[PDB]
Write a protein that binds this ligand. Sequence first.
Ligand SMILES: [NH3+]C1CCCCC1
Lengths: 255, 253
Amino acid sequence: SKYKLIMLRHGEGAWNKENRFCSWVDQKLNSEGMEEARNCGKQLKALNFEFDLVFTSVLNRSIHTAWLILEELGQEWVPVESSWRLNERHYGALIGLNREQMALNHGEEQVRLWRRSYNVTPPPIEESHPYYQEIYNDRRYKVCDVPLDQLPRSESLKDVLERLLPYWNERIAPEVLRGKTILISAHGNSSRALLKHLEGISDEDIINITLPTGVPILLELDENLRAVGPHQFLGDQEAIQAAIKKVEDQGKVKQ
Amino acid sequence: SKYKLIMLRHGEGAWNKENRFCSWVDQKLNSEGMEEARNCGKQLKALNFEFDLVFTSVLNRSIHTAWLILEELGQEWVPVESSWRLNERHYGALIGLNREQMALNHGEEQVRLWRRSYNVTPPPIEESHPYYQEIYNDRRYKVCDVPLDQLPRSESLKDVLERLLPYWNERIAPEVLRGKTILISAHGNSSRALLKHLEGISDEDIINITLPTGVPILLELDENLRAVGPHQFLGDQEAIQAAIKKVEDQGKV
Ligand SMILES: [NH3+]C1CCCCC1
């Protein structure tokens, strides 16, 4: 009849702490991010979750987050599957740049569009970009279901959904319909893309949805795999709203 | 050789210092065992290994070993598959017992026979055993390819090969033939079992094979997946030989 699953975005690493777009740059979790993953695992253990399958992106921070959660649950044996289709949205040329600096240079309105709009596309990352090489030279992108030269160089949230939706429908959703307990260790925007779809959020309303880092996201789906109600956050609601505000404030100018 | 494959047994756990038979008890790696895994990954990175698939058992120490290896390699994205068929030999009633104590009581030769014989089956573990419940009540064994009551309660090395061979033939071997570079993160005796098979080691000769912890083992196979030479421990042979002696000495008074 109804099905519940868990999705979340990993804890913040070095870059996001200093307010820089990370996106496809394969940055590892820091001490704080690791602890955040362990805390999510402890929460899920308290709820006595017994996962059957775990899905992650190919960015190591989402994989490590999943590994830490499984360790906390004593479920390291549970199958894990990783796909670039769950990768964080590709911020193109904006990768590595400071969000507040962009707000000062282009205005808060434009930054909000780049960050949260559905259709706005970031300028494409070019070969001259400081982080182009370490991204596209990695073997993980040489064995994807799409050619290396075919992978995106930037993505709007709509682009993300277009490449993520097929993975959800074809590899995750079937497991949900089989009654399996699933965990999705993803990122801020790839998660927003999935939620927009599952909750039927309008192209206009999705711009106001911001997800806090390191917080289990609860979602219940119906027989048609559509949300029964809006997504919920597991934990201290005040700390969670404060965390959401922090993320929103990274795109704003001081005082 | 036509194909190359890497297999290894994980680093130490708490019962290594205590020198007790761990077997199916899901003990975690200790600080040293984790470092052993990191050193394996660094050694594999130094040799440019790029894995396409990783196989482990369902005992967490072998999984964490694979994870630590992949991290050192920057290959955390490589698919991992786990199976009880790769689990360490089931020591039955001997689980939890101190090896040196048994050697003192029954003789080093007796303990050596129980540890390395290909045919001797240890006494089955009974419900009254101190670690029976901690083993058979785990969900991981409720979802394997055979019923919970079908799982072994003790195994000779021969029994191990018999339940491991099907997995090798069905899941691992095909991937190797496809040209994929495979990493098998297993245990001391389940690894000896696979080596016996791949190298065509006799029932008598397998007794003399003891594997060191946390050392990558390179196996080169031909078109028929038969070893084209004895296994090769990757690293300093002197340190490796001392590591082998360490494992042997666990059974000496
Ligand atoms: N990142 C933190 C957000 C508030 C709950 C604990 C994790």
